[PDB]
Amino acid sequence: VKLYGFWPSPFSHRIIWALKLKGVEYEYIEEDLSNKSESLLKYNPVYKKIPVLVHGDKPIAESLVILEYIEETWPENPLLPKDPYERAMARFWIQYGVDTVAALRAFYLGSGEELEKAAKELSECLKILEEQGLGDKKFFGGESMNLVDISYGALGYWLAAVEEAKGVTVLKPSTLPRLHAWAKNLDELPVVKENIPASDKMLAYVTAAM
C-alpha cells in the first residue's frame, strides 16, 4: 500500500487516520503540488491530485472513495455501521461534508464584508451538523470513530489554524458546545494527534496560502 499525499492537506490526513485505524502498513509519498510526479499523474490522470492510494499498483483517487475502499478491503474494526439505514445516514452526513467544505472555503477566502458573512454561514452550516448529525453522541460513529468522524476531523486542528489566521473563531464552545466538545475530544485522540501537522506549522501554511 502506497499513499500519495501533501503534508498539510486534510484530504491526505483522512486517509492516514483510516489506515492507522485499520493497522495497515503503507508507504507515504510526499507530492510537490507544483511539480507533480510522473507517478501521481499516471495514477490519477482525471484529477491529477492527492490523495491517491495505490494498492498493488491499482490506484484509488478521491478521499471519500478511498475511505470506502479501505473499509471494504479491511473490514476489521469497521468504520461504517452494520445497518443499511445507519450506513445511509453516515453517507448522508459525509455528503453534507461537501456543503461544509464549500462553507469552509468561503471563510478561508473571506476578508472583510464577505468574511463576516462567510463566518456566519459556516456557523449555520455547523449548527445543522451538530444538531441533526452529531446529536448527543460522543462521536458520529456513536462510541467510536466512524468514517463521518474522519471526514469532519478537519473541524478541529485545521479550522482552528484558519480561525487563528483569520482572527475569527466560528467553532466556539458557547454557540456549538456539542460540536466543539466533539472536535476537542477527537483532536486529543492519539490516532489523530500523532497524525496531523504541528499546530505551529499548520498555522504558518494557512497563513502563507492566504
Side-chain angles (χ1 to χ4, degrees), residues 30-48:
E30 180 72 14
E31 272 287 326
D32 174 359
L33 284 197
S34 265
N35 181 17
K36 292 158 163 154
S37 97
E38 287 135 39
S39 272
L40 169 65
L41 291 163
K42 162 161 214 165
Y43 286 135
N44 188 7
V46 171
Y47 285 124
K48 313 189 190 89

Side-chain angles (χ1 to χ4, degrees), residues 98-123 125 158-159 162 166 168 170 210:
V98 161
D99 307 68
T100 309
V101 161
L104 276 165
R105 267 185 195 121
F107 177 69
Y108 180 118
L109 303 175
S111 84
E113 321 140 49
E114 163 60 332
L115 182 60
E116 290 180 23
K117 243 235 168 115
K120 181 82 257 164
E121 278 171 24
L122 181 62
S123 178
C125 176
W158 184 89
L159 173 64
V162 177
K166 281 298 171 196
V168 189
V170 181
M210 270 181 19

